[PDB]
């Protein structure tokens, strides 16, 4: 397809790995680029931690309030919201909104605690059917994104089906699902990003992620003014392991997707 040439066009003149999945869920149509390679997840993990959560309240019903102290050894290398909550507490709700929206790492590793570890997280991955998605390490590390290490990676495919059944399907009960819309919607860090790439007049939730080797990525539900919703994925990693973040990337690819809608 022209699209499929222009986001390898697109991919040759930026000089990494670009990942793209697109589905269209008015006649579930998929548009895929690398879409079974392996990609860092990075921040972009922290969706499944926040859903798996979010799944365990729904038997837990007053599990999101559940107040949860941040001591000064929990707080990693980036934590713009535990920061305002140190030798205090915050919800697991508060945590959820810190993860997705702002990115905050100590919140992301607070989750995962919550699920068990990383094996928790992964378990709800396979509870709902995704198969690639492994989560093998906290905060940080987890962003090391060495290229070939399947630790901590999915697949662009995946992580559209996923994020599709997360956000527009019933993996996750009503309260929960629209709970976690909510949270997409209210994303900080996207702005530059997926969102960058289209109409200002669509409603756009996403979760950014960035690591080592310029790995910059974004997952997002987009509502198109009159118009079914569509999952879009992007990942990007780079072979330098100190190259800078490339979100003017996923702005291009998503500008190249919304091309042809």
């Not at 490339?246 to 291009?252: E, H």
Request: with cysteine; glycine share 8%.
């Amino acid at each position: 397809s022209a699209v499929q040439q222009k986001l390898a066009a697109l991919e040759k003149s930026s000089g990494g790995r670009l990942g793209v999945a697109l589905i269209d869920t008015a006649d579930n149509t998929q548009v895929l680029y690398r879409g079974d390679e392996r990609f860092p997840m990075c921040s972009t993990s922290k969706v499944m931690a926040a859903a798996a959560v979010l799944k365990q309240s729904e038997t837990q019903k007053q599990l999101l309030n559940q107040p949860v102290e941040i001591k000064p050894a929990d707080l990693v290398n980036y934590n713009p919201i535990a920061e305002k909550h140190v030798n205090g507490t915050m919800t697991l709700a508060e945590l959820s909104a810190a993860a997705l929206q702002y990115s905050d790492n100590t919140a992301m590793n607070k989750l995962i605690a919550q699920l068990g570890g990383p094996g928790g997280v992964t378990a709800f991955a396979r509870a709902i059917g995704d198969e690639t998605f492994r989560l093998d390490r906290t905060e940080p590390t987890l962003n090391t994104a060495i290229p070939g290490d399947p630790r901590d990676t999915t697949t662009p495919r995946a992580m559209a089906q996923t994020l599709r059944q997360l956000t527009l399907g019933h993996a996750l009960g009503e309260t929960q699902r629209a709970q976690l819309v909510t949270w997409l919607k209210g994303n900080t860090t996207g702005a530059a990003s997926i969102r960058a790439g289209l109409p200002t007049s669509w409603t756009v939730g996403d979760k950014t992620g960035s690591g080592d080797y310029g790995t910059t990525n974004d997952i997002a539900v987009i509502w198109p003014q009159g118009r079914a919703p569509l999952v879009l994925v992007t990942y990007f990693t780079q072979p330098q392991q100190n190259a800078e973040s490339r979100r003017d990337v996923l702005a291009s690819a998503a500008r190249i997707i919304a091309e042809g809608l």
